[PDB]
Amino acid sequence: GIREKIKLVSSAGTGHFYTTTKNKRTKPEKLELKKFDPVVRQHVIYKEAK
Amino acid sequence: XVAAXXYXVXVXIXXX
Amino acid sequence: ITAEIRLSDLAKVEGGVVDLNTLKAANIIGIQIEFAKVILAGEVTTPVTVRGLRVTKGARAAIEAAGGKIE
Amino acid sequence: RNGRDSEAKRLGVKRFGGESVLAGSIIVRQRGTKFHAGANVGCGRDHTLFAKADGKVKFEVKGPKNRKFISIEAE
Amino acid sequence: PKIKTVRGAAKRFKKTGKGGFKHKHANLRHILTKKATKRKRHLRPKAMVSKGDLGLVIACLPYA
RNA sequence: CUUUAAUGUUUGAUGUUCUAACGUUGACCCGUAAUCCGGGUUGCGGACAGUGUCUGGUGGGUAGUUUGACUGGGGCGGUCUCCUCCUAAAGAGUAACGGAGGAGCACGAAGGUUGGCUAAUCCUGGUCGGACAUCAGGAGGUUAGUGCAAUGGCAUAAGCCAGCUUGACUGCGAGCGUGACGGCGCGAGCAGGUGCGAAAGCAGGUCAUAGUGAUCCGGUGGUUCUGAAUGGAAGGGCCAUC
RNA sequence: GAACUCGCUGUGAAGAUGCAGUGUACCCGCGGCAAGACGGAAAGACCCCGUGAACCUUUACUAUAGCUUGACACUGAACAU
RNA sequence: GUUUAUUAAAAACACAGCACUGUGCAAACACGAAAGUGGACGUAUACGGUGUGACGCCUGCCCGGUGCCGGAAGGUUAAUU
RNA sequence: UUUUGUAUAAUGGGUCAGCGACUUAUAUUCUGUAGCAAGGUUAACCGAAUAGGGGAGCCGAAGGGAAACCGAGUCUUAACU
Numbered sequence: 001g002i003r004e005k006i007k008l009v010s011s012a013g014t015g016h017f018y019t020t021t022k023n024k025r026t027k028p029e030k031l032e033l034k035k036f037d038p039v040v041r042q043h044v045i046y047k048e049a050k
Numbered sequence: 051x052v053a054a055x056x057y058x059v060x061v062x063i064x065x066x
Numbered sequence: 067i068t069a070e071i072r073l074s075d076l077a078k079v080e081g082g083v084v085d086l087n088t089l090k091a092a093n094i095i096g097i098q099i100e101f102a103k104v105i106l107a108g109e110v111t112t113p114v115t116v117r118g119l120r121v122t123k124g125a126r127a128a129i130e131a132a133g134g135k136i137e
Numbered sequence: 138r139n140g141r142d143s144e145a146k147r148l149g150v151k152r153f154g155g156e157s158v159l160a161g162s163i164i165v166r167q168r169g170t171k172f173h174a175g176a177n178v179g180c181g182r183d184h185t186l187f188a189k190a191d192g193k194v195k196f197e198v199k200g201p202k203n204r205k206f207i208s209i210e211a212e
Numbered sequence: 213p214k215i216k217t218v219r220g221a222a223k224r225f226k227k228t229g230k231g232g233f234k235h236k237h238a239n240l241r242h243i244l245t246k247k248a249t250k251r252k253r254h255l256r257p258k259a260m261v262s263k264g265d266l267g268l269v270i271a272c273l274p275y276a
Numbered sequence: 277c278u279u280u281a282a283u284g285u286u287u288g289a290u291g292u293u294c295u296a297a298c299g300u301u302g303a304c305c306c307g308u309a310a311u312c313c314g315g316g317u318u319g320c321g322g323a324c325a326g327u328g329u330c331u332g333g334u335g336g337g338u339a340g341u342u343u344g345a346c347u348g349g350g351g352c353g354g355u356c357u358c359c360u361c362c363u364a365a366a367g368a369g370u371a372a373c374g375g376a377g378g379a380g381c382a383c384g385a386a387g388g389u390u391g392g393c394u395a396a397u398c399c400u401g402g403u404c405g406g407a408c409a410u411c412a413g414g415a416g417g418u419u420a421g422u423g424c425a426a427u428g429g430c431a432u433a434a435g436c437c438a439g440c441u442u443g444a445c446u447g448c449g450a451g452c453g454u455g456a457c458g459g460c461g462c463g464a465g466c467a468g469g470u471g472c473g474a475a476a477g478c479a480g481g482u483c484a485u486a487g488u489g490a491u492c493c494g495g496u497g498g499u500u501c502u503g504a505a506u507g508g509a510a511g512g513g514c515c516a517u518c
Numbered sequence: 519g520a521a522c523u524c525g526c527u528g529u530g531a532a533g534a535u536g537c538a539g540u541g542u543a544c545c546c547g548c549g550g551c552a553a554g555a556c557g558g559a560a561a562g563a564c565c566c567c568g569u570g571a572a573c574c575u576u577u578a579c580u581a582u583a584g585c586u587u588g589a590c591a592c593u594g595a596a597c598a599u
Numbered sequence: 600g601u602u603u604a605u606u607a608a609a610a611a612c613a614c615a616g617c618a619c620u621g622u623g624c625a626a627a628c629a630c631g632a633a634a635g636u637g638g639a640c641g642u643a644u645a646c647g648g649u650g651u652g653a654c655g656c657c658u659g660c661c662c663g664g665u666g667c668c669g670g671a672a673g674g675u676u677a678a679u680u
Numbered sequence: 681u682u683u684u685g686u687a688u689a690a691u692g693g694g695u696c697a698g699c700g701a702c703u704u705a706u707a708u709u710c711u712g713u714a715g716c717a718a719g720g721u722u723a724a725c726c727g728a729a730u731a732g733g734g735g736a737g738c739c740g741a742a743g744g745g746a747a748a749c750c751g752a753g754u755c756u757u758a759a760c761u
């Protein structure tokens with residue numbers, strides 16, 4: 001256990017989201033990555049650990 | 051097991 | 067309530083005008099059918115006037131080549 | 138305290154020397170790189186060797202290590 | 213009397229032009245984060261019923 | 277409005293009193309030459325008690341059922357899914373309550389790429405400092421290391437550092453491997469967008485093989501695809517996910 | 519089931535009147551005895567099995583009669599607070 | 600004294616006596632969708648249930664568990680609104 | 681008959697005669713055969729009744745897609761070598 005499932009939501013206004021896992025105890029900061037958004041068809045910033 | 055536990059309390063068939 | 071009509075059926079209406087009512091009268095579709103579409107199946111060799119029916123691109127060419135009109 | 142075993146993984150050589158293969162055909166499934174990739178042969182993430190062109194399978198030993206290499210001679 | 217259709221089967225199989233049956237792939241309802249995108253992408257399209265299973269499907273769907 | 281006192285008051289509660297509902301298995305009268313029943317008169321209770329509908333608790337009093345399989349008989353004990361090795365007879369596969377061990381994760385870096393680098397152990401000398409901390413030289417040669425079992429691998433390192441980063445991308449996929457099937461696995465290349473590098477190039481997670489659960493029924497977001505007279509909506513479908 | 523129904527040693531679905539080898543034995547009654555015909559009688563009652571049955575138990579599960587709680591109805595009038 | 604009519608007559612059951620507990624009479628309790636009936640034409644020196652079992656000497660410690668009896672402050676909690 | 685395996689001391693039959701177990705209805709698929717053929721065929725019903733009438737229907741001649749929809753194509757995708 002320990003690792004929790006989170007969602008990475010797109011910052012392009014689309015609802016597209018990626019799913020991953022995170023260790024909340026060790027890393028409390030929010031994961032922020034640049035990923036491809038298929039709706040707008042460009043690489044944008046994806047944020048959130050929820 | 052061959053024929054135990056009692057049969058007719060001893061008489062075999064009896065009746066029924 | 068949707069049906070498809072072959073080019074072969076166009077000549078069976080008896081009248082030259084192909085409508086929803088005329089197709090029903092010729093026992094081609096059915097009383098409850100409300101929408102119909104003519105497709106490229108078979109061939110049409112007689113001028114016919116198709117009214118109020120969707121027609122495929124292929125069927126349109128065939129009907130017009132035979133001398134018909136799609137209203 | 139015993140009695141446990143895993144499922145067999147069907148590893149091994151699938152196409153032997155001289156066999157005509159099509160691009161993409163798996164030649165050998167292996168755990169480690171017992172056989173290494175040569176000309177027109179690729180190595181997968183699990184070290185599976187596969188053909189990148191049509192032709193015949195060729196086994197050879199090369200190098201100062203005399204290691205085994207599989208190549209596809211385009212025919 | 214008339215044969216009755218197995219209703220559950222009728223919601224899972226659809227007959228094709230040459231007489232086969234198409235169906236949706238399993239393993240794409242939940243528990244999806246751990247699955248790879250490649251794996252999930254290949255499960256999305258519809259597939260045909262295998263030869264060994266056709267007999268069972270045909271029995272369940274007499275009016276297909 | 278500030279801030280509040282009454283009074284009236286939908287009502288609420290509690291107490292007291294009352295009689296007219298209702299109770300009487302108190303007395304008397306009549307039907308009636310009848311310890312049933314009914315009517316009448318009177319006393320005692322009295323809006324309680326009791327009964328209907330709804331509702332929480334209790335309920336072997338009664339009822340319907342369930343209570344696994346393997347197994348050198350059955351029970352007891354052990355076992356049931358997945359990974360590694362041996363048995364396994366030099367392709368694959370191959371049994372037993374045969375012999376031995378592990379897993380039900382971890383990681384936003386422990387992933388990508390560019391540049392660089394190379395162990396264990398021993399000997400000799402050297403402050404504290406000794407069997408072993410740290411430094412210098414030599415021998416040696418991977419006996420070391422690998423996030424975790426075992427096996428196969430690994431120097432062009434797959435092992436160890438540093439810079440920049442998000443390819444742990446989206447749509448697809450020639451062709452193969454392996455399963456009775458459900459499935460699972462490997463994959464060049466193509467389109468879009470991206471990182472690293474001067475560039476050729478490399479990148480669709482991690483040295484590889486365990487780290488997992490069908491369908492149903494629901495939940496959340498997106499999408500008019502559908503929308504039972506019509507316009508909407510509810511519900512359904514499709515895509516992502518729990 | 520049908521019989522022209524001996525012993526022994528072996529063999530054999532593993533304890534033979536019937537198979538092999540061998541020994542013995544004229545044909546047929548009557549009175550007696552029970553060693554064998556795995557003798558007769560009852561589709562083993564022990565044991566296991568069947569996703570069999572019935573009764574019984576309980577803090578197994580799900581119900582439920584009964585008992586009990588409140589709300590509303592049958593159900594009204596004063597007055598004080 | 601009683602008992603497994605038909606393999607068990609006993610150390611089993613009953614018993615006088617003892618104790619606990621319920622019950623104020625339209626009694627508790629039982630049979631009954633109910634009316635009613637038994638208890639009883641009885642009334643706590645009575646009636647029901649449970650356990651023990653003439654008589655003699657006696658019957659110790661534990662109320663945490665489970666049940667029963669009592670308590671009410673608070674917590675939690677149904678229909679309803 | 682049942683079995684890996686029965687002269688088996690494994691099951692069943694004292695004997696004879698008579699009776700005694702894969703059927704029927706309606707759907708669906710395949711094969712043979714007959715009619716007609718891009719068509720084939722009617723049901724109830726009517727009827728001088730196995731004729732004739734009745735084409736309501738059903739199956740086939742087009743598929744793809746969850747669907748709107750498109751159509752010898754269509755779905756997938758922003759678009760497909």
Ligand SMILES: [Mg+2]
Pocket residue numbers: 093096
């Ligand atoms: Mg018609």
Ligand SMILES: [Mg+2]
Pocket residue numbers: 240241
């Ligand atoms: Mg879904």
Ligand SMILES: [Mg+2]
Pocket residue numbers: none
């Ligand atoms: Mg019971």
Ligand SMILES: [Mg+2]
Pocket residue numbers: none
């Ligand atoms: Mg068992």
Ligand SMILES: [Mg+2]
Pocket residue numbers: none
């Ligand atoms: Mg082998």
Ligand SMILES: [Mg+2]
Pocket residue numbers: none
């Ligand atoms: Mg071999």
Ligand SMILES: [Mg+2]
Pocket residue numbers: none
């Ligand atoms: Mg003898």
Ligand SMILES: [Mg+2]
Pocket residue numbers: none
């Ligand atoms: Mg004699």
Ligand SMILES: [Mg+2]
Pocket residue numbers: none
């Ligand atoms: Mg016998």
Ligand SMILES: [Mg+2]
Pocket residue numbers: 561
């Ligand atoms: Mg038996």
Ligand SMILES: [Mg+2]
Pocket residue numbers: none
């Ligand atoms: Mg006596």
Ligand SMILES: [Mg+2]
Pocket residue numbers: 603
């Ligand atoms: Mg007796």
Ligand SMILES: [Mg+2]
Pocket residue numbers: none
């Ligand atoms: Mg006796």
Ligand SMILES: [Mg+2]
Pocket residue numbers: none
């Ligand atoms: Mg006693």
Ligand SMILES: [Mg+2]
Pocket residue numbers: none
């Ligand atoms: Mg046997």
Ligand SMILES: [Mg+2]
Pocket residue numbers: none
């Ligand atoms: Mg024999």
